[PDB]
Scaffold this active site. Structure first.
Site, PDB file in Angstrom:
ATOM      1  N   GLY A 265       0.930  -1.223  -0.006  1.00  7.48           N
ATOM      2  CA  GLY A 265       0.032  -0.004   0.184  1.00  7.48           C
ATOM      3  C   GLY A 265       1.070   1.392  -0.021  1.00  7.48           C
ATOM      4  N   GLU A 268       6.416   4.298   4.975  1.00  7.89           N
ATOM      5  CA  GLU A 268       6.498   5.612   6.004  1.00  7.89           C
ATOM      6  C   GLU A 268       8.056   6.150   5.784  1.00  7.89           C
ATOM      7  OE1 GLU A 268       5.984   2.432   6.858  1.00  7.89           O
ATOM      8  OE2 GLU A 268       7.367   2.219   8.853  1.00  7.89           O
ATOM      9  N   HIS A 301      -2.165   6.226   8.097  1.00 11.40           N
ATOM     10  CA  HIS A 301      -1.456   4.858   8.610  1.00 11.40           C
ATOM     11  C   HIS A 301       0.044   5.350   8.509  1.00 11.40           C
ATOM     12  CE1 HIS A 301      -0.354   0.662   9.303  1.00 11.40           C
ATOM     13  NE2 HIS A 301       0.755   1.284   8.502  1.00 11.40           N
ATOM     14  N   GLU A 302       0.604   5.964   7.089  1.00 14.31           N
ATOM     15  CA  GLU A 302       1.915   6.437   7.209  1.00 14.31           C
ATOM     16  C   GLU A 302       1.980   7.566   7.857  1.00 14.31           C
ATOM     17  OE1 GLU A 302       3.130   4.098   5.730  1.00 14.31           O
ATOM     18  OE2 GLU A 302       1.576   3.157   4.699  1.00 14.31           O
ATOM     19  N   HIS A 305       2.696   6.526  11.510  1.00 13.40           N
ATOM     20  CA  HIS A 305       4.070   5.975  11.779  1.00 13.40           C
ATOM     21  C   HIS A 305       5.156   6.834  12.285  1.00 13.40           C
ATOM     22  CE1 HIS A 305       4.123   1.623  10.802  1.00 13.40           C
ATOM     23  NE2 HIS A 305       3.733   2.016   9.650  1.00 13.40           N
ATOM     24  N   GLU A 324       3.363  -1.899  13.583  1.00 13.58           N
ATOM     25  CA  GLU A 324       2.462  -2.011  12.709  1.00 13.58           C
ATOM     26  C   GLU A 324       1.098  -2.284  13.338  1.00 13.58           C
ATOM     27  OE1 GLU A 324       2.879  -1.176   9.663  1.00 13.58           O
ATOM     28  OE2 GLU A 324       4.736  -1.054   9.344  1.00 13.58           O
TER      29      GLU A 324
HETATM   30  O1  LIG Z   1       0.506  -2.280   2.911  1.00 14.34           O
HETATM   31  C1  LIG Z   1       0.843  -2.808   3.991  1.00 14.34           C
HETATM   32  C2  LIG Z   1      -0.538  -3.676   4.713  1.00 14.34           C
HETATM   33  C3  LIG Z   1       0.376  -5.132   4.689  1.00 14.34           C
HETATM   34  C4  LIG Z   1       0.834  -5.719   3.304  1.00 14.34           C
HETATM   35  C5  LIG Z   1       1.192  -7.183   3.465  1.00 14.34           C
HETATM   36  C6  LIG Z   1       0.156  -7.828   4.188  1.00 14.34           C
HETATM   37  C7  LIG Z   1      -0.176  -7.346   5.562  1.00 14.34           C
HETATM   38  C8  LIG Z   1      -0.941  -6.189   5.389  1.00 14.34           C
HETATM   39  N1  LIG Z   1       1.550  -2.195   4.858  1.00 14.34           N
HETATM   40  C9  LIG Z   1       2.827  -1.348   4.571  1.00 14.34           C
HETATM   41  C10 LIG Z   1       2.792  -0.572   5.888  1.00 14.34           C
HETATM   42  O2  LIG Z   1       2.787  -0.837   7.028  1.00 14.34           O
HETATM   43  N2  LIG Z   1       3.025   0.765   5.742  1.00 14.34           N
HETATM   44  O3  LIG Z   1       3.367   1.595   6.772  1.00 14.34           O
HETATM   45  C11 LIG Z   1       3.867  -1.959   4.224  1.00 14.34           C
HETATM   46  C12 LIG Z   1       3.749  -3.420   4.108  1.00 14.34           C
HETATM   47  C13 LIG Z   1       4.983  -4.154   3.606  1.00 14.34           C
HETATM   48  C14 LIG Z   1       6.210  -3.292   3.241  1.00 14.34           C
HETATM   49  C15 LIG Z   1       6.978  -4.119   2.537  1.00 14.34           C
HETATM   50  C16 LIG Z   1       7.566  -3.852   1.213  1.00 14.34           C
HETATM   51  C17 LIG Z   1       8.488  -4.591   0.440  1.00 14.34           C
HETATM   52  F1  LIG Z   1       8.775  -4.114  -0.830  1.00 14.34           F
HETATM   53  C18 LIG Z   1       9.417  -5.578   1.146  1.00 14.34           C
HETATM   54  F2  LIG Z   1      10.318  -6.191   0.484  1.00 14.34           F
HETATM   55  C19 LIG Z   1       8.943  -5.985   2.589  1.00 14.34           C
HETATM   56  F3  LIG Z   1       9.567  -6.602   2.972  1.00 14.34           F
HETATM   57  C20 LIG Z   1       7.932  -5.258   3.453  1.00 14.34           C
HETATM   58  C21 LIG Z   1       6.135  -2.160   3.133  1.00 14.34           C
HETATM   59  C22 LIG Z   1       4.845  -1.329   3.540  1.00 14.34           C
HETATM   60 ZN   LIG Z   2       2.707   0.469   8.216  1.00 14.49          ZN
END
Ligand SMILES: O=C(CC1CCCCC1)N[C@@H](C(=O)NO)c1ccc(-c2cc(F)c(F)c(F)c2)cc1
Ligand SMILES: [Zn+2]
Ligand SMILES: [Mg+2]
Ligand SMILES: [Mg+2]
Ligand SMILES: [Mg+2]
Ligand SMILES: [Mg+2]
Length: 889
Positions: A265, A268, A301-302, A305, A324
């Site tokens: 998605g 941050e 959300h971002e 963070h 998270e």
């Molecule tokens: O998009 C989401 C929700 C998440 C997506 C994975 C399944 C559980 C729900 N989370 C963000 C996040 O927390 N933004 O603050 C997010 C999740 C994973 C990653 C991420 C991206 C990568 F390309 C990657 F290699 C990794 F290890 C983590 C980056 C942001």
């Molecule tokens: Zn996050």
């Protein structure tokens, strides 16, 4: 594969104090020069200096400006750079390197990569090591001084973290920008962006310090008209953290950037948040309604963070849920306050109990703080996020708002500027708990089991009422099924928010009450209860558990009509549906197994149907809530309750129940569909992107839900309504017209019409793809082949691939075709995708997560395709680890 264990955490023998980067972007390659000012830590024991560095081409490496020689002084194996300890200084030193990387062909979208004409990074969790050498773990905090250079015409906008301190021209049509970010940060929060970006901006003045913050939202030029709502959402996010938590933004500027190619998605990165365009960009002409809540959620959300993750960061990746789960909880508080509609909380619960409960009863089950990992990319899960959020939310339920805020501030003030662990948060909450209880002997030691114990608890009830004594008791039991993580499951600290409803007048019989269940079972007694109540249990869904309310359908109907709590009303409805589904499923199953020539089905409860009608016809009742009560529970929720689930038999069961209810209520549905039109489709604010009306969108959700029910039912002349709906200016409506037309001979006419409306906006076209993918068509395999040939082709854009395939996988009757052809199709897509994007290939495995819950034939068919995928010689680490865990190998 290397397994990392939580218990093995130990500080590095090294320190990195300063990072000085030069990132020079060229046509065919990007050159990265880096100087690391380093030191020896108190934990050092004369070890080799080992850097992470993945896929780097070494031009040179040096220590204190002396060039190191390969083989004699260092080895590099495309994963680790090892400098032998005899060549590692014993005091402060400089390590420098120049490497070459290739963002143009980096289709895995981790590290530094190209998305259309934008160069962008994604470093969480361990992607910084794909950009340059580092000790790539979040406890290695350092200062960053970053210079980016590039062709000026192609890349006029250059961004990184911190303040832009210089801009300069370079011979040959190039330019550079230098960014200095003095505050310490972990390397996963580094980011850089280069591109021909356009923006909207505003100035925000903070509530208390009265600091001016510059806000910028960026996209490619084509979509700059879709930036407004994001900017509004960012302002709202800042105000909410100020208003609820007393927290202000600490930096001069915050940038949000949309890119077309993104694995998840948004991200941050400090001062430079990077988004999947589908979670930042919208306009009312080119977006469905769901985009508006999505952008609000993801921008929020971002932003949240910045405290929970950026200012207070993680010691190690096992603490992921600390940032998270806590940030999702903050995001949910925010979105509940902004939308002011009960369906916001209900939508969170609906997601948890379908998707996350499925994961938690699958071979993939893990606690929100796992004990080990191999792939960090696979570590980001709905368990860590959404169960983590519910665990963070239970502290608020237990403490109440005033003491929750007190505990949260203790956490922030104590850990600001430092790494932290899940224990640090529990400690802060415990200090508040002592205060609330007025008892320094009170503790939350038991609460820590929510972090370590996997699986979903089951909570069940028995009641007793003595009329003479006016005394009521609630007997409660909890149980978690043993699994591969714990043979013996301990009782959890489970807060049960409850009310007692007087069945004669629908009124509350007690004040707000949260039962604290801390044992395997307990009996809660209430005196001076004048009449036998109906209990309202787990108000607001107060713990992430399977609720067995042991109420009659008569009692559940009374709650559905008259209770004060939206979740308990929704849940009582859910429970009536589930009892019906399980009964009819068994009846159909027996008829199938026994090859019966005739048999009986138990009809839907008539008083239940009357109650639905009652709520639907109440003009003061909420439209969003109405759309939930006419919808059966999600298939993924249902599957948690059935062994060896025959998907065909479930499809027949749902069909029977929908037809039963429709045969009584279709005229009501039609009348509502028509009367809702004026308010639902009001265009007064269509050209104002600052004006978002969540109640109006819920009215459209209701209108589109009803239209689907009426179209499946072949309600007389409903095709007239469908055709008129296709002319609505709102994409939610005209895309709905496409999916509900599946039941009519005008489907491909609307397919062409809506394609033409969608094709010139990248994100709208993806929504059109999803609509086609989810269409209830007998010829859906042929349609998918047409999408592949005519629209999808060999796109490597995760949004394109997910749009074409994931909705179809939720087609109960067709995806689970007993030939196994749907399983074969998705496995081919997974293997194809794994060649260039392992993280997204692993996402595409989602429909296989329930494989061992299906009937024996479908189990065999799914397992065959997973074993086929596992035998691919070129399988990725991500996909191999995932499928090995999922298939219990
Ligand atoms: O998009 C989401 C929700 C998440 C997506 C994975 C399944 C559980 C729900 N989370 C963000 C996040 O927390 N933004 O603050 C997010 C999740 C994973 C990653 C991420 C991206 C990568 F390309 C990657 F290699 C990794 F290890 C983590 C980056 C942001
Ligand atoms: Zn996050
Ligand atoms: Mg490389
Ligand atoms: Mg304010
Ligand atoms: Mg594209
Ligand atoms: Mg196993």
């Amino acid at each position: 594969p290397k397994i990392h264990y939580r218990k093995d955490y130990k500080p590095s023998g090294f320190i990195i104090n300063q990072v000085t980067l030069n990132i020079n972007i060229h046509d065919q390659e990007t050159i990265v020069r880096s100087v690391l000012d380093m030191d020896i830590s108190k934990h050092n024991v004369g070890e080799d200096l080992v850097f992470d560095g993945v896929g780097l081409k070494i031009n040179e490496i040096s220590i204190n400006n002396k060039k190191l020689v390969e083989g004699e002084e260092y080895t590099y194996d495309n994963e680790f750079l090892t400098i032998f300890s005899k060549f590692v200084p014993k005091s402060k030193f400089a390590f420098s390197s120049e490497v070459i990387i290739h963002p143009e062909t980096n289709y895995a979208l981790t590290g530094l990569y190209k998305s259309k004409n934008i160069i962008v990074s994604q470093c969480e969790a361990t992607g910084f090591r794909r950009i340059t050498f580092f000790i790539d773990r979040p406890d290695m905090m350092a200062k960053y001084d970053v210079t980016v250079t590039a062709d000026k015409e192609k890349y006029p906008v250059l961004l990184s973290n911190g303040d832009k301190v210089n801009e300069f021209e370079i011979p040959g049509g190039r330019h550079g920008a230098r960014f200095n970010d003095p505050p310490l940060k972990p390397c996963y929060l580094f980011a850089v962006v280069a591109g021909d970006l356009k923006h909207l901006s505003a100035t925000y003045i903070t509530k208390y310090t009265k600091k001016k913050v510059e806000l910028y939202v960026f996209s490619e030029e084509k979509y700059v008209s879709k930036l407004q709502w994001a900017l509004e959402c960012l302002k709202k996010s800042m105000a909410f953290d100020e208003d609820y938590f007393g927290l202000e933004y600490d930096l001069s500027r915050l940038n949000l950037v949309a890119v077309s190619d993104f694995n998840v998605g948004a991200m941050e990165n400090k001062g430079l948040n990077i988004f999947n365009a589908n979670s930042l960009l919208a306009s009312k002409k080119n977006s469905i309604d769901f985009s508006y809540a999505r952008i609000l959620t993801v921008v929020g959300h971002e932003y949240f963070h910045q405290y929970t993750g950026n200012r207070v960061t993680l010691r190690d990746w096992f603490q992921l849920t600390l940032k998270e789960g806590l940030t999702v909880h903050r995001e949910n508080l925010f979105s509940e306050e902004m939308t002011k509609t009960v369906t916001t909380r209900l939508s969170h619960v609906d997601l948890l109990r379908s998707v996350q409960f499925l994961e938690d009863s699958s071979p993939l089950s893990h606690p929100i703080r796992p004990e080990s990992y191999v792939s960090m990319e696979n570590f980001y899960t709905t368990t860590v996020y959404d169960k983590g959020s519910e665990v963070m939310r239970m502290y608020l339920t237990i403490l109440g708002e005033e003491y929750y805020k007190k505990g949260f501030d203790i956490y922030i003030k104590k850990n600001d500027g430092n790494t932290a662990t899940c224990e640090d948060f529990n400690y802060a909450m415990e200090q508040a708990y002592k205060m609330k209880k007025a008892d320094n002997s009170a503790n939350l030691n038991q609460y820590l089991l929510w972090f370590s114990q996997s699986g979903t608890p089951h909570v069940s009830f028995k009641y007793n009422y003595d009329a003479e004594k006016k005394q009521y008791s609630i007997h409660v039991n909890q149980y978690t099924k043993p699994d591969e993580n714990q043979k013996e499951k301990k009782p959890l600290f489970i807060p049960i928010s409850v009310g007692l409803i007087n069945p004669e007048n629908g009124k509350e019989m007690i004040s707000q009450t949260t039962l604290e269940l801390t044992k395997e079972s307990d009996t809660f007694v209430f005196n001076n209860i004048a009449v036998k109540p109906i209990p309202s249990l787990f108000r607001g869904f107060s713990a992430p558990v399977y609720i067995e309310d042991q109420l009659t359908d008569e009692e559940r109907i009374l709650l559905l009509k008259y209770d004060s709590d939206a979740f308990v009303r929704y849940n009582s409805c859910t429970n009536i549906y589930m009892k019906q589904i399980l009964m009819n499923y068994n009846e159909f199953l027996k008829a199938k197994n026994e090859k019966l020539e005739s048999f009986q089905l138990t009809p839907v409860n008539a008083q239940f149907i009357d109650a639905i009608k009652y709520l639907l016809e109440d003009p003061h009742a909420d439209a969003g809530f109405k759309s939930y009560i006419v919808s059966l529970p999600q298939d993924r929720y249902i599957i948690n309750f059935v062994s060896n689930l025959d998907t065909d038999v479930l499809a027949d069961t749902k069909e029977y129940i929908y037809k039963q209810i429709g045969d009584k209520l279709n005229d009501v549905y039609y009348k509502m569909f028509k009367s809702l039109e004026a308010k639902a489709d009001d265009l007064t604010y269509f050209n104002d992107e600052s004006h978002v009306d969540f109640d109006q969108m819920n009215m459209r959700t209701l209108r589109n839900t009803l239209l689907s029910l009426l179209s499946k039912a072949q309600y007389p002349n409903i095709l007239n309504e469908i055709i008129e709906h296709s002319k609505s200016p709102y994409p939610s409506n005209w895309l709905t017209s496409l999916s509900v037309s599946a039941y009519f001979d005008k489907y491909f006419e609307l397919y062409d019409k809506t394609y033409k409306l969608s094709k010139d906006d990248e994100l709208l076209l993806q929504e059109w793809l999803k609509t086609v993918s989810r269409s209830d068509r007998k010829d859906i395999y042929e349609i998918l082949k047409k999408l592949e040939n005519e629209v999808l082709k060999d796109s490597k854009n995760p949004n394109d691939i997910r749009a074409v395939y994931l909705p179809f996988t939720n087609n109960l009757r067709r995806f689970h075709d007993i030939s196994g052809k749907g399983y074969k199709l998705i496995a081919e897509v997974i293997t194809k995708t794994d060649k260039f994007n392992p993280m997204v290939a692993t996402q595409l495995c989602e429909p296989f997560k329930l494989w061992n819950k299906l009937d024996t034939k479908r189990q065999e068919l799914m397992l065959n395709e997973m074993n086929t995928m596992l035998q691919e010689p070129q399988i990725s680490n991500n996909l191999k680890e995932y499928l090995l865990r999922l298939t219990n190998k």
